[PDB]
């Protein structure tokens, strides 16, 4: 495998009011629940179930049961932010988020933009 | 003021469509073991006072007027003051000699006639 439920793994929340946020497992309550934390201020330390999260490939060195302050310092030290963003997963998600906000005028400018890019067809020319 | 009718379908006698000997006119089912009397599901409806229509709009035609049967010119003159509430209806046995004089009189009186073009032709 590539992903295991271990202390220090970075997980992505996919259910509830914290959907789309990033968190790192701090403690293993049980095979169905785990304690997570995030350096972001709006994300508090909480116990979440594995059904509401997906494990990313990023694993970061954390002592068991670290406090939020220590986790935030370790998160900055290990440069987890912009490392997940370097993955194509985050770029796909970020592109989807930016696409959702796009209004009608931006959509119109896109169609003209992708119309110009389409006619290139410089293959075998 | 709009005329509201609680029901437009008539109340047919039960089992009147299975026999020619039993007419369509409504008869109360006296049978005790009858499903129609006990008002099961799928059984037909029965005349109840709940179906009674508004008192103000009772006897009113869809145009808002109440029919008034007229047999001669003297009858139609009674509607001089009630031409916005009543419509003249010439009786079926009134001849064409009198039907024309009722229609001409009802025209000056400003009275609607429900069957003004009956048993006559026109000549412009």
């Amino acid at each position: 495998f590539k992903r295991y439920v271990e202390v220090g793994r970075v997980v992505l929340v996919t259910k509830g009011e914290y959907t789309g946020k990033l968190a790192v497992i701090v403690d293993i309550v049980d095979h169905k629940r785990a304690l997570i934390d995030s350096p972001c201020s709006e994300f508090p330390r909480q116990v979440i179930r594995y059904g509401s999260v997906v494990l990313t490939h990023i694993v970061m060195k954390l002592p068991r049961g670290a406090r939020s302050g220590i986790v935030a310092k370790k998160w900055k030290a290990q440069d987890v932010c912009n490392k997940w963003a370097s993955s194509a997963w985050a770029k796909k998600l970020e592109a989807k988020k930016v696409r959702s906000q796009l209004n009608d005028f931006d959509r119109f400018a896109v169609m003209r933009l992708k119309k110009q890019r389409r006619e290139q067809v410089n293959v075998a020319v | 003021v709009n005329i509201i009718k609680k029901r437009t379908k008539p109340f047919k006698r039960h089992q009147s469509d299975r026999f020619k000997r039993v007419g369509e006119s409504w008869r109360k089912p006296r049978g005790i073991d009858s499903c129609v009397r006990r008002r099961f599901r799928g059984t037909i409806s029965m005349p109840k006072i709940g179906y009674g229509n508004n008192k103000k709009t009772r006897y009113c035609m869809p145009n808002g007027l109440k029919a008034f049967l007229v047999r001669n010119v003297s009858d139609v003159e009674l509607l001089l003051m009630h031409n916005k509430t009543y419509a003249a209806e010439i009786a079926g046995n009134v001849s064409a000699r009198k039907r024309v004089e009722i229609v001409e009189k009802a025209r000056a009186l400003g009275v609607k006639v429900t069957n003004a073009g009956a048993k006559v032709r026109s000549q412009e």
Partner: protein, 186 residues
């Protein structure tokens, strides 16, 4: 969500009851549903369990083809006694394998009926076509032979499409317009 005028469903790894229920509901929605690979339908439970279930049914016409087995399950989930359920059945075409008209068409799957997403790991399941092989169906061997023949041709088309796709993909970044206004997420 969004629908199509005609739908081609790949019945490989789909549970019989779960797929039939979704298909029957879609048929009553006016959609036209075509189910291919009906002989790879899976049913939860041991192959002994379904063999006696079918053997009990053998003890009307006892159809042996896997496509007609699936149609029977779909038929029971429709008001076939009325005209509405009669018209729904005529809008379904269950076939074994992938016939040529549906060979070159997109084949969707129903995640609510997929065996992997609905069956506990390690649970014994039986394949409808494999189960029907010992009840009277005698075309399983040839149906597999065409399936591998179709797969080889399908794989060759995919390589041609993938090789062609590499050309536009390479030229996608060649055009500066892509990088110039990629701020829209595109």
């Amino acid at each position: 969500s969004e629908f199509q005028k005609v739908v081609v469903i790949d019945a490989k790894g789909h549970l019989l009851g779960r797929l039939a229920s979704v298909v029957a509901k879609q048929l009553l929605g006016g959609q036209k549903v075509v189910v291919v690979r009906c002989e790879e339908l899976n049913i939860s439970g041991h192959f002994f369990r379904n063999k006696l279930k079918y053997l009990a049914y053998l003890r009307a016409f006892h159809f042996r083809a896997p496509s007609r087995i699936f149609q029977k399950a779909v038929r029971g989930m429709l008001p076939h006694k009325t005209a509405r359920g009669q018209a729904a059945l005529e809008h379904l075409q269950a076939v074994e394998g992938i016939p040529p008209p549906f060979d070159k068409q997109k084949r969707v799957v129903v995640p609510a009926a997929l065996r992997v997403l609905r069956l506990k790991p390690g649970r014994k399941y039986c394949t409808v076509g494999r189960l029907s092989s010992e009840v009277g169906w005698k075309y399983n061997d040839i149906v597999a032979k065409l399936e591998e023949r179709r797969k080889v041709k399908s794989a060759a088309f995919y390589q041609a499409k993938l090789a062609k796709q590499k050309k536009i993909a390479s030229a996608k970044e060649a055009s500066p317009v892509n990088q110039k206004l990629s701020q829209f997420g595109y």
